Amino acid sequence: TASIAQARKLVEQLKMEANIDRIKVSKAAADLMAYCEAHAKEDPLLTPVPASENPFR
Amino acid sequence: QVQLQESGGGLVQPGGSLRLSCAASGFTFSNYKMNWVRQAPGKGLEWVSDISQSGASISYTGSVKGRFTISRDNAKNTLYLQMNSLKPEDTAVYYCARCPAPFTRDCFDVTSTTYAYRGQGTQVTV
Amino acid sequence: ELDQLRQEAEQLKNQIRDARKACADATLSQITNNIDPVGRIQMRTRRTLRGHLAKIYAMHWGTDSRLLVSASQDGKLIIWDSYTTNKVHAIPLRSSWVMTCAYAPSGNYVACGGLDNICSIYNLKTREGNVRVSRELAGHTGYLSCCRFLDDNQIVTSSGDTTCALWDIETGQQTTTFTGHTGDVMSLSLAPDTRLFVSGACDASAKLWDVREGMCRQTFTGHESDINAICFFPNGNAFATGSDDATCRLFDLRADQELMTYSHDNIICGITSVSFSKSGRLLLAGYDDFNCNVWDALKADRAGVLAGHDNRVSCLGVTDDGMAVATGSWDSFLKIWN
Amino acid sequence: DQRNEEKAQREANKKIEKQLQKDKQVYRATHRLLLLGSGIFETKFQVDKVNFHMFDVGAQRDERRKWIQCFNDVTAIIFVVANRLQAALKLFDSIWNNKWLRDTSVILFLNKIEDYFPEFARYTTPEDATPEPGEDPRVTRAKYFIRDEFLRISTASGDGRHYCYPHFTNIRRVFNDCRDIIQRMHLRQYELL
Amino acid sequence: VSLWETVQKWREYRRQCQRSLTEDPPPATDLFCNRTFDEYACWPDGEPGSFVNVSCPWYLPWASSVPQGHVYRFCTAEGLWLQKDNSSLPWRDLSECEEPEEQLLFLYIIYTVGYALSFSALVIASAILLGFRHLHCTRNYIHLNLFASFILRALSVFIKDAALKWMYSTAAQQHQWDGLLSYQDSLSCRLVFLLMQYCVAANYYWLLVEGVYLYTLLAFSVFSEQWIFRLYVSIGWGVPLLFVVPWGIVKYLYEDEGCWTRNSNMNYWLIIRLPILFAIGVNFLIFVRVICIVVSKLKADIKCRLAKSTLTLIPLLGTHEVIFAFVMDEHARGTLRFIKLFTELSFTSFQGLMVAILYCFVNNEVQLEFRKSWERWRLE
Ligand SMILES: N#Cc1ccc(COc2cccc(C3=CCN(Cc4nc5ccc(C(=O)O)nc5n4C[C@@H]4CCO4)CC3)n2)c(F)c1
């Protein structure tokens, strides 16, 4: 039977996902906010820019 | 993850009714057309019955027409199947399954190559 | 060992849910509500490409952000030029359904593949004659849905027979094999370091994978339906997923759980293909109701609508510098948005 | 110089566009036939000098909900069948009631009683079709009853954009049904129906 | 018998008066009233003191009724006729010759309104077909070419309508305008009439092209799109050229005078009315075949669907043209054929309005494009 083999692989997957660390959701949201505030100045589609630099005119 | 639990099981005499409550949670119950799939020993998976999101579109397998009764509880997010007029060849593993896409009617849960939205299954031995 | 293993697995999954609840002291919207949004950002159709016969299922931009590879279902991979609205090469096949297409990170190789299980690699040099299959990677037993080049030497192929594998070109065999899934696999994406990658599976479980590990690091069982869309946030840390249950659960690797759910009440249809911009604030998603609704990353507001097509969209790429967005729908057109 | 490279780009563009015109000619001469009950069985043949590339599926993982969706551009899905019959009814209902199979008319084939369907005895039999000689009338009634079951599942919210065609087991009937689907699709183009 | 044939008989009598002024011998006395023609009567060389009682000529609608009307004009003894004043003309006792148009003007008004409304509605329909671009199929190119044929037919009837309303009866009242009407029959008359008949025949041939294309897509199912579209364009602007250029050569080489409508040959209109009526017959055969195909697909509620099918297909491929082709059998009975063909031309020219209503409201994909553009304009 392969059901016990799939069960043992599932137990190994559960232990492998339980042997990791956990970082704060507020710290992750602050990192996302910092990345957005860093790259919104250089994002062409976010900032309304004239069509001179845009080759699609 | 869509967790799916059933009720009942064990050895039962042919002719005694038994409830089949599908303890389901973790998802919006009023947006999916759930169904039942049984698996006989020595036979592939086959469709049993269904009920729609409202509760009007109710169909049955051609061999168990009228002898089974399906009902859903929209408030307490469970599926209540009722077996009546049991037969010793109709025993199987009754998987509580769910059709994958919302607001539609197409269902592809009869395939036996590990459709991963079926229930864990309870053997009801008739 | 099935009953006690079942109870122990249920208890450990409940412990994982409790750890995610303990990490979830507050939602992301309640702590990022103080951020002033950019506002309504409209776009305009600039180009319209007319060279297709069947529906367009997949596209992919280039690292130069000037060329793109279109995958139709007549059997013709057509390399389009964006800013000069012209064509470069047309790649034929003996099969029809081209379910995937990829472009090289250096711009030398083009992948394809469908139900025929032949992952062909087309060189972009053309020394002797026209384009030609250099080597083939036919090893899967189901179908091929999405493949993306890591480098010019190897490519990972998300297959339909639940077996994901990395494929070296010159060996013609599996370098490594990842069979951690249970259902079908639709799409994947690549982090900017080209080392960590995820896999969108059809059992509501996103799996973080890695080349050097040979085993999955994390598993995100947050969705309710099948997943047809997955893409990384451009920092390489977070990633957004798209499912058919009208939600877009924003995930993050280091946060171990979801961040934001895009469940709009007037949308009862699925999500086809998602991508981020160069900043990552513009959530560019492909819906089923004939338009691509632009969503905000941190405020969850409809910043715009992209309804230039007439049929279902299937693929949505964004340039590596944020120049243009070309959505490939089932109307045999390629509307480029700016 | 932009002029020389732009003229070479125009020449290559005109060459690829003439290739796309030849591909458009051979593709509008191409009609597709999906067959279900390498990785794909491309069966190429012509009937009355009309191209019919028939496509059968073989070794595939049969969660069909993700690879059927790339078959909306087909002209006719040939659905041959011969419990297997109830799963065939459920699969036919799932194909008929999909969101993106509304413009795909399904050609249906049959082959091959009282235990699987106990409601067979309450059927009224029409004499509109002349039976083949040497046949049991009970087996004939069962065969036309299976046809009427597939037809009532078809007409149960059929939406009018596509129609089923049950048949019994050649290629000439497949050609006639492809002509039927093409003519009905063009009459819905010209809106005469 | 109407004012058209009245002016034609007046032009014939004018040619006879030119012959009389070529051969009119004066008497052998120098004091006489000279030759003259005041555009109403061809007065010969008269004698002073003689009441010249010539009859009213045969071009009038009432001179055939009363042929005993003898008009009078006195010749004075100074070589001039009796004038009675210097402000008026020479005096002439024309009181003995004094004793349909409104219905013709009503027909003119109603087909003017019909062609104008069809022109406006099909400019709007062409704007829809060139603005939405999801309607960019080959049968839509055929429908756009048919709509352009209707627009050019409206332009042809508008360039034909020069002064037909305001020259209604001013010929017999003031004969300065009657002689200018014969001056109006020039090369511009032939060019405008040839362009209008060319475009009307082109509209019939585009109806045949659309019928053959629809029958081809139904029955034949073989096509190479660019070559077939170029062949249909070449037919649709070549066979009107192929049946109007020899028509114009027959005009230029066999015409004596006039603007060449019904003169003397039967070949002049046989060349132009054999292929048009044969085209109407072929279109009727294609109609019968397509209706039999629709009945076959419907039998393989019922009467309402068949009625909707025929009321859709008659503005596309009209049997009203077959009926009017079976009504106005000419056979050189062209004496006042203007009513005979203007009843046809007035009961038609609503077909452009009908197909505009069809391809702007009835077609579900076009209505879906209207709804989609309205939703996108609401979202903008
Ligand atoms: N000479 C003269 C003359 C001109 C003008 C007046 C003024 O009084 C009235 C009275 C009634 C009708 C008329 C008309 C005059 C010119 N007609 C143009 C015209 N349209 C036509 C369409 C088909 C056909 C055909 O198939 O036979 N023919 C057409 N034609 C005629 C073709 C073009 C050259 O002949 C329209 C009606 N005029 C006149 F008294 C004699």
Name the residue ranges covered by the structural domains of chain B. 1-126
Measured CA to CA, the distance from residue E226 to residue E204 in angstroms comes to 23
Q: What is the distance of C-alpha E284 from the center of its chain?
A: 24
> Which amino acid does the sequence have at E321?
E
**What b/e string do you get for E105-127 counting C-beta neighbours within 10 Å, with b at 16 or more?**
eebbeebbebbebbbebbeebbe
Query: Considering CB atoms only, which of C182, C203, C225 is closest to B102?
Result: C225
Burial class (CB in 10 A: 0-12, 13-18, 19+), C283: buried
Find, among B41, B43, B81, the residue nearest to B64 by Cα. B81
Domain that holds residue A34: 4-56
CA distances from D126 to D108, E302, E348 (A): 20, 21, 49
> Which amino acid does the sequence have at E377?
W
Token code pair at residue C223:
């969705």
Domain that holds residue E164: 101-379
Residue C334 pairs with which residues in a beta bridge? C49, C328
Cβ distance C23 to C63 under 8 Å? no
Q: Residue C245: list chain B partners with CB under 8 A.
A: 31, 102
Classified as helix, coil or strand, C325 is strand
Expressed in angstroms and rounded, the spacing between residue E263 Cα and the centre of ligand 1 is 13
Query: Considering CB atoms only, which of B31, B102, B116 is closest to C182?
Result: B116
Provide the resolution (angstroms): 4.2
Q: What are phi and psi of C272, to 5 degrees?
A: -90, -55
Residues in chain C: 338
Tell me the best of E1, E4, E165, E348 to mutate to test the pocket of ligand 1, counting ligand atoms within 8 Å of each CB and taking the most: E4
Cβ distance C70 to C82 under 8 Å? no
DSSP code of D54? E
Cβ distance D10 to D2 under 8 Å? no
Q: Which of C143, C162, C181, C225 to mutate to test the interface with B (most CBs of B within 10 A)?
A: C225
Residue of chain C whose Cα is closest to the Cα of B28: C224
Say which CATH class D32-189 falls into. alpha beta
DSSP code of C294? E
C4, C7, C9, C10 alpha-carbon torsion, rounded to 10°: 170
For residue B66, give how far its alpha carbon lies from the nearest alpha carbon of chain C (Å).
31
E251 Cβ below 6 A of ligand 1: no
Query: Considering CB atoms only, which of C46, C219, C252 is closest to A17?
Result: C219
DSSP strand pairing (B122-125 vs B45-50): unpaired
Domain ranges across chain C? 1-338
D and A adjacent (3 or more CB pairs under 8 angstroms): no
Expressed in angstroms and rounded, the spacing between residue E255 Cα and the centre of ligand 1 is 17
**What b/e string do you get for D71-103 counting C-beta neighbours within 10 Å, with b at 16 or more?**
bbbbbbbbbebeeebbbbbbbbbbbbbbbbbee
Token code pair at residue D161:
């954009």
**E336 conformational bin, left if phi > 0, alpha if psi -120 to 50, beta if neither:** left
Q: Residue C5: enclosing H or E segment and its boundaries? A: helix C3-23
Judged by CB atoms closer than 8 Å, whether chains meet at C87 and D13 is answered as: yes
E193 Cβ below 6 A of ligand 1: yes
Residue of chain D whose Cα is closest to the Cα of B101: D65
Tell me the best of E170, E338, E341 to mutate to test the pocket of ligand 1, counting ligand atoms within 8 Å of each CB and taking the most: E338
Measured CA to CA, the distance from residue E91 to residue E88 in angstroms comes to 8
Cβ distance C330 to C314 under 8 Å? yes
C189, C191, C195, C196 alpha-carbon torsion, rounded to 10°: -70
**What b/e string do you get for C9-41 counting C-beta neighbours within 10 Å, with b at 16 or more?**
eeeeeeebeeebeebeeeebeebbeebeebeeb
Residue of chain C whose Cα is closest to the Cα of B5: C10
Q: What angle do CA C314, B30, C9 make, to 5 degrees?
A: 85
E157 Cβ below 6 A of ligand 1: no
Domain ranges across chain D? 32-189
Cβ of D16: how many Cβ atoms within 10 Å?
Answer: 20
Cβ of E85: how many Cβ atoms within 10 Å?
Answer: 8
Find, among C66, C98, C40, the residue nearest to C294 by Cα. C40
Query: Considering CB atoms only, which of D62, D98, D116 is closest to B111?
Result: D62
E337 Cβ below 6 A of ligand 1: yes
DSSP code of D2? H
Measured CA to CA, the distance from residue C156 to residue C159 in angstroms comes to 9
Cβ distance D61 to D125 under 8 Å? no
Specify the CATH number for the domain of residue A42: 4.10.260.10
Tracing tokens 């969209």 back to the chain, one arrives at C313
C and D adjacent (3 or more CB pairs under 8 angstroms): yes
Expressed in angstroms and rounded, the spacing between residue E261 Cα and the centre of ligand 1 is 9
Ligand 1, atom 27: closest residue by C-alpha: E261
DSSP code of D124? P
Judged by CB atoms closer than 8 Å, whether chains meet at E376 and C307 is answered as: yes
**What b/e string do you get for C179-215 counting C-beta neighbours within 10 Å, with b at 16 or more?**
ebbebbbbbbbbbeeeebbbbbbbbbbbbbbebeeee
Residue E47 lies in a domain: no
Mapping DSSP onto H, E and C, the string for B19-86 reads EEEEEECCCCHHHCCEEEEEECCCCCEEEEEECCCCCCCCCECCCCCCCEEEEEECCCCEEEEEECCC
Find, among D28, C72, D32, the residue nearest to E227 by Cα. D28
CA distances from E165 to C13, C16, E61 (A): 93, 93, 21
Within 13 A of B43's CA, how many CA atoms are on the CB side? 16
E237 Cβ below 6 A of ligand 1: no
Q: For chain E, state the CA radius of gyration.
A: 29
Q: Determination technique for this PDB entry? A: cryo-EM
Mapping DSSP onto H, E and C, the string for chain E reads CCHHHHHHHHHHHHHHHHHHHHCCCCCCCCCCECCCCCCCCCCCCECCCCCCCEECCCCCCCCCCCCCCEEECCECCCCCECCCCCCCCCCCECCCCCCCHHHHHHHHHHHHHHHHHHHHHHHHHHHHHHHCCCCCCHHHHHHHHHHHHHHHHHHHHHHHCCCCCCCCCHHHHCHHHHHHHHHHCCHHHHHHHHHHHHHHHHHHHHHHHHHHHHHHHHHHCCCCHHHHHHHHHHHHCCHHHHHHHHHHHHHHHHCCCCCCCCCCCCHHHHHHHHHHHHHHHHHHHHHHHHHHHHHHHHHCCHHHHHHHHHHHHHHHCCCHHHHHHCCCCCCCCCCCCHHHHHHHHHHCCCHHHHHHHHHHHHCHHHHHHHHHHHHHHHHC
Measured CA to CA, the distance from residue E292 to residue E301 in angstroms comes to 18
Residue of chain C whose Cα is closest to the Cα of B2: C224
How many domains does chain A divide into?
Answer: 1
Burial class (CB in 10 A: 0-12, 13-18, 19+), C326: buried
Measured CA to CA, the distance from residue E41 to residue E70 in angstroms comes to 11
Expressed in angstroms and rounded, the spacing between residue E192 Cα and the centre of ligand 1 is 12
Ligand 1, atom 3: closest residue by C-alpha: E4
Query: Domain B1-126: which topology?
Result: Immunoglobulin-like (2.60.40)
Query: Considering CB atoms only, which of C305, C310, C331 is closest to E379?
Result: C305
Token code pair at residue E275:
């292929």
Judged by CB atoms closer than 8 Å, whether chains meet at D97 and B113 is answered as: no
Q: What is the distance of C-alpha B98 from the center of its chain?
A: 9
Q: What angle do CA C67, D17, D52 make, to 5 degrees?
A: 110
Cβ distance C54 to C72 under 8 Å? yes
Within 13 A of A40's CA, how many CA atoms are on the CB side? 16
E261 Cβ below 6 A of ligand 1: yes
Residues in chain E: 380
Measured CA to CA, the distance from residue D193 to residue E312 in angstroms comes to 10
Q: Residue C290: list chain D partners with CB under 8 A.
A: none
Judged by CB atoms closer than 8 Å, whether chains meet at C330 and D72 is answered as: yes
Q: Which of D164, D192, D193 to mutate to test the interface with E (most CBs of E within 10 A)?
A: D192
Q: Check if E161 contacts C (Cβ < 8 Å).
A: no
Query: Considering CB atoms only, which of C81, C95, C161 is closest to D40?
Result: C95
Measured CA to CA, the distance from residue D4 to residue E27 in angstroms comes to 92
Cβ distance E81 to E33 under 8 Å? yes
Superfamily the domain C1-338 falls into: YVTN repeat-like/Quinoprotein amine dehydrogenase (2.130.10.10)
Token code pair at residue E107:
């027909």
